[PDB]
Design a protein around this ligand. Structure first.
Ligand SMILES: [Zn+2]
Length: 165
């Protein structure tokens, strides 16, 4: 079921697929990344291409089966929305969630800098992942608001991995 070797111990893992590179946040023992970047799965685990377990195309999301290769952050809805997002490498900025699919980036920046920041996570002020960046709202040439996938959508995969048959 994928390579999944070498201890990851990382809340967010940067990877690259046949189309591009972006981010994936481990949540509830499930690595979640952005569908508009993975496509035909086969990304890069700790050391080898891993296969995806589920894919919410209607929601543009894909969740793998992370186990001993992921720290997995805590979901928790959090009444407070002072979240924090990290870019492909770091960029720790505070974003106030404006909805389950929207967050207000307190620090506007050129959307080009957010290229690959999608698939990351908006962590509550306590270290709880509740939103994975899905799209940047760029006005003149900088994102003035971040759109992201809801963690509640990850729970549906946990209830049943697609279950087509
Ligand atoms: Zn939380």
């Amino acid at each position: 079921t994928g390579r999944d070797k070498n201890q990851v111990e990382g809340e967010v893992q940067v990877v690259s697929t046949a189309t591009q590179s972006f981010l994936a946040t481990c949540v509830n023992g499930v690595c979640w990344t952005v569908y508009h970047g993975a496509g035909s799965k086969t990304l890069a685990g700790p050391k080898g291409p891993i296969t995806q377990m589920y894919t919410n195309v209607d929601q543009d999301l894909v969740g793998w089966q992370a186990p001993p290769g992921a720290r997995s952050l805590t979901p928790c809805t959090c009444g407070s929305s002072d979240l924090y997002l990290v870019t492909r490498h770091a960029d720790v900025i505070p974003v106030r969630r404006r909805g389950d699919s929207r967050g207000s980036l307190l620090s506007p920046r050129p959307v080009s800098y957010l290229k690959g920041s999608s698939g990351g996570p908006l962590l509550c002020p306590s270290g709880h992942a509740v939103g994975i960046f899905r799209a940047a709202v760029c006005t003149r040439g900088v994102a003035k608001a971040v759109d992201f996938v809801p963690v509640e959508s990850m729970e549906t995969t946990m209830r049943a991995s697609k279950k087509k048959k």
